[PDB]
Amino acid sequence: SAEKLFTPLKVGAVTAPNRVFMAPLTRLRSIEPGDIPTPLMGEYYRQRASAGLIISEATQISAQAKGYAGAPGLHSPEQIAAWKKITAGVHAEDGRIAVQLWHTGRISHSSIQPGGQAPVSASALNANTRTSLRDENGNAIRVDTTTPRALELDEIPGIVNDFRQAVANAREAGFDLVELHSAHGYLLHQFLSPSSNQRTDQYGGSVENRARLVLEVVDAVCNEWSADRIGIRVSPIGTFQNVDNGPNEEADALYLIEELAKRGIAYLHMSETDLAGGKPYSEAFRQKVRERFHGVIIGAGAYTAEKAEDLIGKGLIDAVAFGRDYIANPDLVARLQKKAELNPQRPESFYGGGAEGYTDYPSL
């Protein structure tokens, strides 16, 4: 029956009935041209509406933000209209959903950028990894990332504004909250990490400079909507998609969190490790984070229900976001509550394709 995973939690402007959240999961099944959400995607989210909180797959704040074929956007009328149906479906089932907004930065390819030009980032350094495009038959394919163009100083205000606008669109689209994707090596993290940021202006160098952009974004969206509607996901400890967190990751992470706390935002979502290995968070560190943020804290990364109960019981985190278990178990809440077995995962269909391996996993 579990001790606390199934107890309500106030998350900013809304209230989750349980602490089992669905982590943001890129599935690359949107319509192109237009990067438009689909009815199928609506069904997928609706099947998982019993989650304490649904965090959508990463969504573009602009066309320039696009880095993967099939990923949705929230910048055009068509996209807004499609998302409105998806949030309505979730609400029809009494669920809550937040839209994760990102700008992929250097984790992109020129073929899917506006005008077919090079993607942008903090510096002109290749991410040295690959992204997902679609072939002539619409099938997902891996391709090496394009070397980025360093953003000009006078272009940064435009970036902040795209985030601001997307949040405004998210509000009209019916989303309950918004989660800024400031992790996993995407644009915001590109600026935060010294390994990917070699700028010599006020957006590079010190942690204060490196964190400038993300903080300007946080202030802009808090002003556009409301601080209790804002969430942010970070992955400040370890290495992700080739972007590490610098020689003083812990101290830099604590600085960022204290700054975020000043805005009084809804929640802090901590992605502890990427899909590959990663040194685990020490309780000492969890305590330092805990005492610096006064909003909800969500833990994530290969979590087990037992680990969730342990850390929530110790009062270190408030909720847990499950990724892969949610892909395969729409009614994960009921299964964890009843201690039932889960459906096996089918990794080959995580990205692209159709209903198979998407709205395919049965509920109890």
Ligand X SMILES: C[C@]12C=CC(=O)C=C1CC[C@@H]1[C@@H]2CC[C@]2(C)C(=O)CC[C@@H]12
Residues that bind ligand FMN (CB under 6 A): 23-26, 57-58, 100, 181, 183-184, 233, 271, 300-303, 322-325, 350
Please indicate if the annotation marks 58 as binding a ligand: yes
* Among ligand X, ligand FMN, none, partner that 130 touches (CB below 5 to 8 angstroms by kind): ligand X
The CA distance from 255 to 330, in Å, is: 37
Least distance (Å) from ligand X to the CB of residue 140? Answer: 8
- 113/271 with CB nearer ligand FMN: 271
Instruction: Please tell me the count of residues contacting ligand X according to CB under 6 A.
Output: 6
145 binds ligand X (CB under 6 A): no
The answer to whether 181 is annotated as binding is yes
Is 256 in a helix, a strand, or coil? helix
Output 18 or 326, the one with its CB closest to ligand X. Answer: 326
3-class SS of residue 297:
strand
φ, ψ for residue 8 (rounded to 5)?
Answer: -55, 155
Residue 186 among the catalytic residues: yes
- Nearer to ligand FMN by Cβ, of 204 and 322: the residue is 322
Residue of 44, 45, 68, 186 marked catalytic: 186
Are the C-beta atoms of 175 and 95 separated by less than 8 Å? no
Distance CA 72, CA 30 (A): 6
From ligand X, ligand FMN, none, interface partner of 233 (C-beta below 5 to 8 A by class): ligand FMN
Q: How far is the CB of 364 from ligand FMN (least distance, A)?
A: 20
Residue 154 CB, shortest distance to ligand FMN, in Å, is 29
Distance between CA atoms of residues 357 and 84, nearest Å: 24
Assess 343 for contact with ligand X (CB under 6 A).
no
CB 298 within 8 A of CB 21: yes
Q: Is the peptide bond before 33 cis (omega within 30 degrees of 0)?
A: yes
Q: Which x/- pattern over 174-193 shows residues binding ligand X (rule: CB under 6 A)? A: ----------x---------
Round to whole Å and give the CA distance between 1 and 312. Answer: 15
Kindly state the smallest distance separating residue 157's Cβ from ligand FMN, in Å: 25
Contact of 21 with 320, CB cutoff 8 Å? yes
Q: What does each C-alpha distance from 338 to 6, 320, 344, 345 come to in angstroms?
A: 11, 18, 17, 20
The CB density around residue 2, as the number of other CB atoms within 10 Å, is: 17
| Residue positions counted in the chain | 364
Which of ligand FMN, ligand X, none does residue 350 bind (CB under 5 to 8 Å by kind)? ligand FMN
319 is in an annotated binding site: no
Handedness of CA 196, 254, 26, 97 (dihedral sign): negative
Binders of ligand X among residues 210 to 269 (CB under 6 A) are none
Is residue 120 within 8 A of residue 78, CB to CB? The reply is no
Tell whether 323 is in a known binding site: yes
Paired tokens of 259: 């700054």
User: According to the annotation, is 184 in a ligand binding site?
Assistant: yes
Q: What whole-number distance in Å separates Cα of residue 85 and Cα of residue 106?
A: 31
Q: Does 64 bind ligand X (CB under 6 A)?
A: no
Residues recognised as catalytic: 186
- The annotation places the binding site for NAD(+) at 26, 142, 181, 184, 324
- The annotation places the binding site at 24, 26, 58, 100, 142, 181, 184, 233, 302, 323-324
- The annotation places the binding site for progesterone at 142, 181, 184
Contact footprint for ligand X (CB under 6 A):
26, 58, 130, 132, 184, 351
- The annotation places the binding site for FMNH2 at 24, 26, 58, 100, 233, 302, 323-324
